[PDB]
């Protein structure tokens, strides 16, 4: 689609080695993906 | 007894050391300009014998005037080490005291006292030139009450 | 003007900037994806990342543009986009007393072209974008850290970088030097949930999913 | 045997304008390249602002260019007000212009006197720092702080001028030109000062434009450009003044430009004193500017709005702006992104000193080591805004 | 204060104190809140 | 302002200007440190009618 | 699109070639770093540290990630060669002050709640 | 009661000088060279 | 009133005092524990109750704009007193 | 555990280690390292000092805010010991002096002061006492120092039977008075040694090993009532050791056999100095003596520590004694000295 | 409008050239500089005799913090936490609960004075004039710990400085 020398790459993007995050805070963390509940007060 | 002579000699040396407190201009941030305002004619830090000094080899007190960053801390410790003794550190402003506005930053050391021992903590953001002058006179009164020769006489 | 509180709207400049945006889009269809004018009369040109040098050179050199000054070059991190990084060029035309904004996009692994050949001012801005966001700039004369400590790991201005980072610095008397340790806070930063559960601006309401 | 002295140091040096590591190699006596190493005062200001409410982020701008506090907060206030689609009241605008010119006097005094002190003329520093102390008194009388007023806010200014402040500002300004005269009696015609500034750090006008220079670094090279005139803000279009223009683009021309800018600042200050209008000093819209404390303690709506403005803050409509002012050090701007909430999504700060110090290597070409001290002084550099 | 004396309050210090830093009268910080979690105390009577 | 006539003349001559009319030290010309109480005006929307917030 | 543009290397072998060049440069630099910074470590220790830093990223398969790792490694090498780093910066690869953290389940259970 | 805020005086403030004022002082170069020459002449005599 | 702990430590107005086994008392040794001796609860307890003759009374804390947000207090309960929720002043209808 | 003494955090500066330690002798060589190791993990450190408070300033950045507390104390006063000891759960005794003064002889600092600290700590109810005697301590020693060290071990075990006695050998470090002592002999020409040092064998130990061993003995529940010998990994003949010291410092090494009696006269002459004598008769005796072997004692490896060799940490001590000619030389340009083993 | 700062060409006649030659050889502008310094030597210095004389301040001056009371002695703070919410540096830590008499009062009120930027936002946010920045500016300490203020410390500051704090507030509250 453009002259950028398209190079074949796997579809498992992994930027962990470039984020600078210490290794403890990658494998041992567990993130939660959610839509926050409505605050029942309002 | 012979403790009177030692007390008098200590008094003399501590009067000479606080009457010629030569500080080192460590102006990192906004606190630097209030310190040169304490330098300015209105307060005239030179009238107390507190001169405008130069390379740490002739400095008696370090004034940490401004934010200390992680990139900058090794240089501050280096020049602190290069000061001949006796040497004192005055932490001026919230940033130098405990991090201040930038306490929760990735690049700011939370207080210069993590890097050097600090004698006087001057609060304010910035402390007024009068507040810094009060801290300097308080440091002078700290020096007046040292008992180095009396400590030695009872060893 | 019986509205002393509302900011006055200037429609002449809005029309002028609209016409110039049409002009720029027509001259460079190959790279211009979108052009828009804000309600406070600021013109933005959205471009493909390939068109950075062509569009910037056109805006600098065209006799009807003459945007000789690079006011600012920064990046914006938007994690919810696959191209998370938004590269923003702010340009000023002294000849026509006008300003223009040029924006493109990139991700963590695609290099943006260095624009130091267009503006010499871009040398430190691109280093700062690389330092704080991790965006690589191909053909940069000297790309390296500018703001962060030597050997600093990570890119702090990314939205997923923690506010206090990962390491602290202190002087250690055993090893006689300043050392780095994992960050511990005697008082952790207190997260505030401030957003109101009621919609403030209906005119910006996104259509429902 | 190429052993070009790579003296890559000098942060503790008193002439380092605070904190600056200079990596320098010399072909004998003359400078071959300059490599400024900055970040020694990078405090993550732009990231911290993302965790602060719009009001909570205002004091951060006092500490960017900590010689020009009120100008920085004026620029930030203008950006936030543009995003909010609100207008500050006329009296607030006149106060903002008056204190911006007072701030320009403060900054120019600091710049010129520290430049001279670095060159070796220590005496003018004290004479003018007395005037700086008096202007600090004006700052403190209006806000309670000598430097970091936090006085100019999105919507206007925090509180009104105290009674008798205009009289004291008039008393100060009517004598200040005599101090500029004494400063010039020591520097302008001195054959040693000119020997240290004439034809030193010459920058071409086109090359100044392409390097992103602004302010005096532009008008030193003869470029006729000033934001206060071409793109006026507040009530600057209603005030009359002159834009001093250089001819040789060297340190001496820039020094003359700064001195004449002090004179024109006095000229603007006179009109601000004579044309200060009555009225309120913040926008009469309690969903942006907090109500008066008397109304807060009496009226339900005022109490609610005080509570919400001081806990959540006002929501800014989504959008991005780049607004710039003619700061005393050049063009100071902010690229402020709003996502619609009460906290800025992104706040990039444009500081003229960043681009100016990026050009130190270019301007120091073929100059001695002592000339780099002058070139740094002529680009007046505060690393609080260089590093942010 | 001779011509315009301050308003009398019964809680205002009647004796001004200077900066007592570096003296045994110096202020030392402490937590002013009470303990949050109460532990279970075992019975003093043995089960056997 | 306490300087003698001769000293004033010497410093006026040395500076080349009459510096006694533009002294850098402040004197009784300053405003009193105690001022009368102010009475600040209200904004344009301090009205009882014709003031709906949707119109401003 | 389906494919992406490279940083430098159009393939994994090119990325490996640049990795080897960077490894060579670092390996030769280590003795000069030990001498110049007056480090209290041995050249074997420093070169083993260089190798262990390289071995952290051995699992990387994306040539663009490898290219960016090489770019950052060359940046670090230039900070070391030009003596922009201090001794404290060079010595931060060796976490001499940090205590040995537990690794087995039992000790981690004893000292706290972290997994 | 009427409003009372910090205001300019009813007649406005007096003019403030801002323009450069470096006075002309001294003798011409001819006078200086004549004096310098005559001084040397009398010294020699 | 400000009392004493069994260890002799002074008890603040929030009721804080370290127990006899708390090592943190070492911070006060060769020093002092800073305690404000004006307990606001005991001070507001000393104020009389105003006998205002209305069902609803208003209190702004005294001094007008220098007090607290003006509030209105109902005085219909004849067993309780109506007290201000800002400054603690108490009000009651005359002699029931 | 008291509720405020429960460990929290991750072992960093802002953590809580559950340790409240009074470190007698914290202002000395060994003291600055155990104080640093205690403040590293977030311990409450009580520092008794008799020196000028200026001399305790290097310990202030060693711990988080409030975690290092400085208090005046008098070695000849039990009330001061009680005051600085009341709230601690571990007491570390590090006070000592390599010379007698007009007010404190070896019996005072090695017998009376440790016994007072042990007895006051037992009375106040501190759970742990760590006492630092010498490896070579001997009731029939030629040295007053070591005879008093033996007497003090007896007295400390009598007053505080659960105490952990630690017996290091000659500790070396950046301010050790062991490597610096031998490296300071270049000022008097050559290096005088009794019997040329060919009969003395030393087993020096590294300061960080001693400090980490003290910390580990604090944390180890099976160190009560125990006696430890903190020796280094290698034994050296004194001639070989001093030769290696001078080779690392790059100073010329020309020893000569000063006899014992002349060396004692030399030491007696130096005792006249009223400021930190350069050497003494007692130091002359203890340098010439060989370190004992006590295989029956647990050591630094029974606390989980690998002893650091001298040939690894000697450059960080001796690089200060090198001239400008050899200031920037690697640690391996000098081959390790010959080791005598058992 | 603009003006030129260095666009004057020197005159090239006998008298002007001789004027410049005399200025070159006889150092006349250097003598003008010496005259300016000599004139400053005979001027009264602007120095004040600190601490016996003090720099002038205003009622708005923002110094050491204090917690205030009503004339009844009751605290003003009703623990709304507005100051803690608005604090730019997050220097204010607050815990509250119902008091034994039912009042809404703080049990913790800490200000990290080394985190504080002394902006005065807390006293603006406060609806009851409870937290203020007082006039005191001479409170330097010899240790870091004495700058981490307590509720007791701040209340003692209020009792210490209320006499002049109240006068300052009366002087400036009509501007607020
Ligand atoms: C060469 C020196 C020649 C003699 C100078 C005499 C002098 O300056 O007299 C002051 C007198 C007044 O000077 P001023 O600056 O106008 O005084 C301003 C106020 O009136 C000043 O008003 P005031 O109320 O401050 O006056 C009181 C003041 C008055 O002080 C004097 O009169 C000082 C006289 C010094 C002789 O005395 C004090 O304050 C006491 C402290 C004195 C300090 C030390 C004085 C000098 C000691 C010299 C060493 C002694 C051993 O000088 C003159 O009238 C001009 C003399 C010019 C001489 C040629 C140029 C030099
Ligand atoms: C022009 C100048 C001409 C010459 C002027 C001479 C003035 C003489 C007056 C006294 C000078 C200072 C003497 C004390 C030195 C400084 C000091 O406080 O030392 C404390 C020190 C303290 O020793 P210490 O042993 O307690 O502590 C050292 C060890 N540390 C730091 C780890 C704790 O005193 C000494 O070292 C001994 C001093 C002996 C007495 C000297 C009397 C004066 C001798 C000269 C006459
Ligand atoms: C005969 C040789 C005696 C050597 C004594 C000695 O080492 O003194 C060191 C010390 C020198 O120690 P210093 O090098 O720490 O310097 C001490 C002086 N102040 C504290 C001011 C820095 O000797 C002296 O001070 C003189 C003591 C008397 C010397 C004569 C003794 C005759 C018996
Ligand atoms: C050392 C002692 C002498 C110190 C210097 C002289 C006194 C300085 C202070 C008083 C004068 C203040 C300035 C002034 O009046 O300037 C007038 C004027 C100012 O001149 P101008 O700079 O305005 O130039 C006008 C005159 N033309 C155009 C011709 C150059 O200067 C003079 O009159 C200087 C005359 C003396 C020159 C120096 C002589 C040195 C050799 C003496 C013997 C050795
Ligand atoms: N260093 C070694 O090679 C060996 C050391 N040890 C033992 O290790 C311990 C620590 O040694 P180290 O740190 O090197 O010794 P230092 O001499 O360097 O420090 C001794 C400490 O004891 C204090 N002290 C000494 N005498 C008195 C006294 N009379 N009253 C009060 N305090 C006093 C000192 O306080 P101040 O500084 O104020 O005088 C200082 O804190 C000692 O018990 C020592 O005998 C055992 C074997 C070998
Ligand atoms: C002086 C003291 C020290 C001071 C200085 C301490 C640090 C010095 C080094 C600093 C840089 C750091 O190593 C990071 C970089 O450069 S990372 C380069 C990419 N790294 C990869 O791993 C790519 C993928 N890897 C493979 O493809 C293979 O696994 C491998 C190549 C490893 C072996 O290939 P082989 O054919 O099996
Ligand atoms: S304490 Fe305040 S004034 Fe001082 S350097 Fe920090 S931010 Fe600037
Ligand atoms: S003055 Fe500002 S920074 Fe300090 S406590 Fe108040 S709101 Fe926070
Ligand atoms: S001090 Fe004022 S703002 Fe802060 S919690 Fe108390 S009442 Fe609210
Ligand atoms: Zn009330």
PDB file of N, CA and C and ligand atoms in Angstrom, chain K residues 67 77-83 94 109 126-128 130-131, ligand 9:
ATOM      1  N   UNK K  67      -4.394  26.413  62.397  1.00  0.00           N
ATOM      2  CA  UNK K  67      -5.805  26.072  62.505  1.00  0.00           C
ATOM      3  C   UNK K  67      -6.467  26.983  63.530  1.00  0.00           C
ATOM      4  N   UNK K  77     -12.593  24.056  61.901  1.00  0.00           N
ATOM      5  CA  UNK K  77     -12.556  22.973  60.929  1.00  0.00           C
ATOM      6  C   UNK K  77     -13.668  21.971  61.192  1.00  0.00           C
ATOM      7  N   UNK K  78     -14.489  21.736  60.171  1.00  0.00           N
ATOM      8  CA  UNK K  78     -15.538  20.730  60.234  1.00  0.00           C
ATOM      9  C   UNK K  78     -15.231  19.611  59.249  1.00  0.00           C
ATOM     10  N   UNK K  79     -13.947  19.449  58.922  1.00  0.00           N
ATOM     11  CA  UNK K  79     -13.432  18.278  58.211  1.00  0.00           C
ATOM     12  C   UNK K  79     -14.138  18.032  56.880  1.00  0.00           C
ATOM     13  N   UNK K  80     -14.440  19.098  56.138  1.00  0.00           N
ATOM     14  CA  UNK K  80     -15.024  18.935  54.811  1.00  0.00           C
ATOM     15  C   UNK K  80     -14.036  18.345  53.816  1.00  0.00           C
ATOM     16  N   UNK K  81     -12.735  18.483  54.074  1.00  0.00           N
ATOM     17  CA  UNK K  81     -11.621  18.008  53.253  1.00  0.00           C
ATOM     18  C   UNK K  81     -11.476  18.788  51.953  1.00  0.00           C
ATOM     19  N   UNK K  82     -12.030  20.000  51.860  1.00  0.00           N
ATOM     20  CA  UNK K  82     -11.861  20.796  50.648  1.00  0.00           C
ATOM     21  C   UNK K  82     -10.407  21.204  50.450  1.00  0.00           C
ATOM     22  N   UNK K  83      -9.728  21.584  51.535  1.00  0.00           N
ATOM     23  CA  UNK K  83      -8.319  21.955  51.446  1.00  0.00           C
ATOM     24  C   UNK K  83      -7.472  20.776  50.989  1.00  0.00           C
ATOM     25  N   UNK K  94      -5.930  14.201  56.046  1.00  0.00           N
ATOM     26  CA  UNK K  94      -7.048  14.406  56.956  1.00  0.00           C
ATOM     27  C   UNK K  94      -7.727  13.076  57.254  1.00  0.00           C
ATOM     28  N   UNK K 109      -4.965  15.810  61.103  1.00  0.00           N
ATOM     29  CA  UNK K 109      -4.808  16.946  60.195  1.00  0.00           C
ATOM     30  C   UNK K 109      -3.310  17.239  60.099  1.00  0.00           C
ATOM     31  N   UNK K 126     -11.226  26.769  52.054  1.00  0.00           N
ATOM     32  CA  UNK K 126     -11.862  26.554  53.346  1.00  0.00           C
ATOM     33  C   UNK K 126     -13.114  27.412  53.488  1.00  0.00           C
ATOM     34  N   UNK K 127     -14.276  26.819  53.772  1.00  0.00           N
ATOM     35  CA  UNK K 127     -15.507  27.616  53.881  1.00  0.00           C
ATOM     36  C   UNK K 127     -15.698  28.286  55.231  1.00  0.00           C
ATOM     37  N   UNK K 128     -14.828  28.039  56.209  1.00  0.00           N
ATOM     38  CA  UNK K 128     -15.062  28.508  57.569  1.00  0.00           C
ATOM     39  C   UNK K 128     -13.835  29.228  58.112  1.00  0.00           C
ATOM     40  N   UNK K 130     -10.894  28.082  58.615  1.00  0.00           N
ATOM     41  CA  UNK K 130     -10.250  27.228  59.608  1.00  0.00           C
ATOM     42  C   UNK K 130      -8.748  27.125  59.365  1.00  0.00           C
ATOM     43  N   UNK K 131      -8.354  26.705  58.170  1.00  0.00           N
ATOM     44  CA  UNK K 131      -6.947  26.638  57.801  1.00  0.00           C
ATOM     45  C   UNK K 131      -6.552  27.956  57.151  1.00  0.00           C
TER      46      UNK K 131
HETATM   47  S1  LIG L   9      -9.452  23.132  57.287  1.00  0.00           S
HETATM   48 FE1  LIG L   9     -11.243  24.054  56.220  1.00  0.00          FE
HETATM   49  S2  LIG L   9     -11.149  23.171  54.120  1.00  0.00           S
HETATM   50 FE2  LIG L   9      -9.787  21.880  55.409  1.00  0.00          FE
HETATM   51  S3  LIG L   9     -11.132  20.178  56.110  1.00  0.00           S
HETATM   52 FE3  LIG L   9     -11.226  21.773  57.735  1.00  0.00          FE
HETATM   53  S4  LIG L   9     -13.043  23.031  57.178  1.00  0.00           S
HETATM   54 FE4  LIG L   9     -12.519  21.805  55.329  1.00  0.00          FE
END
